[PDB]
Design a protein around this nucleic acid. Structure first.
Lengths: 188, 175, 188, 188, 125
RNA sequence: UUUUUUU
RNA sequence: UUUUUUU
RNA sequence: UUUUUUU
RNA sequence: UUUUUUU
């Protein structure tokens, strides 16, 4: 009962993959820094964008001094303004890993995508919070290694045809970022 | 300082894992000389299966040479070796690489049985998709020399087969 | 007693980040190899460059054979020549992580940056060393992935208006690199 | 801390899916019947086909008298003939569930696909068996219910340009089928 | 600016010579004193720890000259809930050649490490 | 096969 | 609210 | 909501 | 071989 296959063996050796060795040399001191950044003023014209938290100019002014930066908490917030009652505005948003191929115009076609109606007399003008789940999305936005699954926020907003001249709401992100390992930069 | 980067602790239950099988024909050999290098992690076919997930790891992986009805009359040489993708060895240096194999397919007795060459996934990085990009994933180098007066049909086929473990859905749109 | 905010929940699922599986078997042996590489001949004309240690052609001839390379010690040295005393040369240098945005003209605005006067009369003594602090720079220049903060050397040099035809000094780097896990290469 | 969603409930009732109730009325007698069917005579011209075991005319002459038919064992066999030594022939085949979209020309692009070289002086003219895995493929080719994953055999064969006039090999399938539950048919 | 508490861990002044120092020797004198000291730049040598150097001229091109600040004689806390009177103050005096160069003969810098804590709310604009 | 990796 | 301070 | 399924 | 009989 012979088999119809010949097995050829490629000689092996002891060679393995590797990353970063352990700290055991005094785990570096970590500081936590708070932030609130206004990403957009909506309601005067349609708008749509994708914000990669790890590439954000403003947040980068804090992480530029360190080699490691990890989000402790993160959320987006929509704050209705004095123009929301008379000019209802649509705002849709969803949080996805940065390597997702989803675009701002496909929020409702993405699992978890939300769409809100801001303003409208009968409506409520209470602000809305949408937390980013840092157990699904990778919170390490800066490290020795480059990660591809950090938080990316997608948002779309539709304004009234006959729009106001002042925004109906502000979209901001807020959280705290753990910083460590000074990265030598110039002071000039 | 000295704080490069590791991961935060797995919160709860680890995500479910599924295995998807595959077999791909890389080349039809014996009608003309051939030589190529195939980086598994960059393969178009595999990419369609991993596109929906965040983590993809090879479970088993091997190359197989399948002699055809033209091998008996047209002996063909096939050489191949598995190396990490960052190796700079080229397809024409298989026998100058530790573990490189060169086979004679057809013409002589017993030379028409198919041949398997497993990739050692403890010597090559099996993770082809994760939170970061790796540089040492499997790369197959192959070289083939055909008879001067070659046939019009291939003397053998080179395929690779295995299974990929997929996990952690990557949010995408339905559109 | 009533809060002024609305919480919206983005539907979640079990999806986590990931890297390398646990290390299986015996770890491979490590060896340290000493080296000294000449990076530049200075003094015949103004010069300024930035050298990324991880992508240096010469050092790569040592790391080409392995998968993991880690610096144990690393320093830069300025060796003066017999032409330095007649043609004093300014040489300034600093070590920074590769992802630092500092430039050769900002050495003195960067921690650890030094500006020297080579020759002129003096500064012919036991060549000047400028050690790299491996706790502020990632010493691993080769592994399963590429790192962003490996050593980068910045240097700036000003030569005399009426310059010599032979260099007034040489800039080299010296150190020891730990190598492990052979990488299959051809022996041709 | 109010939520931004209203939950509406659709009234339910006790309604469930269902199939076939248990036997408890005397499990029907089962008989096992053997078969060997020649599917093709290869080597005189290229050939390619897909054979759905549940639709096979010949096997159906046995199952036509019953309501339930289940394969106990099943395999394909290639038997080289007196013309194989001088006329090497290629035969490729693979077993897949009937609902697979794979076609006869894609055997080697399907997990498990095999390709053999039959004949050739230096070769062997020993017959070859390729068992169908009845734990992966659904063995019930006939029942009260129609199943979509029963065994389907795909095969491709390439013959010599200057071919023989008699086949170089025969492809057959053989096994045993468990039959039960007489299905009333006419005897005329 | 981003924090409420700042304390110096190490602090020093350094004089880095340039290629012009050897042809144009420069006198440089410096001393560290608490901010509430009444000493002036012309009294460096009459103050404890004050040093007067000759930069270039031929020599003094070696590994830049450091002058460490003693944090037990100077208050290292430069930022807290209140303002302090004795934080570090650096005094320096320099005499150049009568016929001076058009490029500097040396640079004076300060280097150190500062301990920061208690974030201070600032705008991110 | 140009077999000494998986402790 | 743009909620992770009061051990 | 036009809530009486998940024993 | 087209191997599932000899409990």
């Amino acid at each position: 009962m012979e088999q119809d296959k010949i097995l050829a063996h490629q000689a092996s050796l002891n060679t393995k993959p590797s990353l970063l060795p352990p700290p055991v040399g005094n785990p570096p001191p970590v500081i936590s820094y708070p932030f609130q950044i206004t990403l957009a003023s909506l309601g005067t014209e349609d708008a749509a964008d994708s914000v990669s938290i790890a590439s954000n100019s403003v947040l980068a002014t804090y992480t530029a001094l360190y080699r490691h930066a990890q989000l402790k908490h993160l959320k987006a917030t929509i704050h209705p303004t004095y123009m929301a009652p008379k000019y209802p505005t649509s705002v849709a948003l969803v949080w996805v890993p940065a390597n997702s191929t989803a675009t701002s115009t496909q929020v409702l076609d993405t699992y978890g995508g939300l769409h809100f109606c801001i303003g409208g007399s009968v409506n409520s003008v209470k602000p809305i919070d949408v937390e980013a789940n840092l157990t699904n999305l990778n919170p390490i936005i800066k490290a020795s290694t480059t990660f591809t699954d950090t938080p990316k926020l997608l948002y779309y907003s539709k304004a009234q045809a006959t729009a106001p001249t002042s925004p109906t709401c502000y979209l901001t992100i807020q959280g705290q970022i753990e910083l460590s390992s000074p990265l030598l930069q110039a002071s000039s």
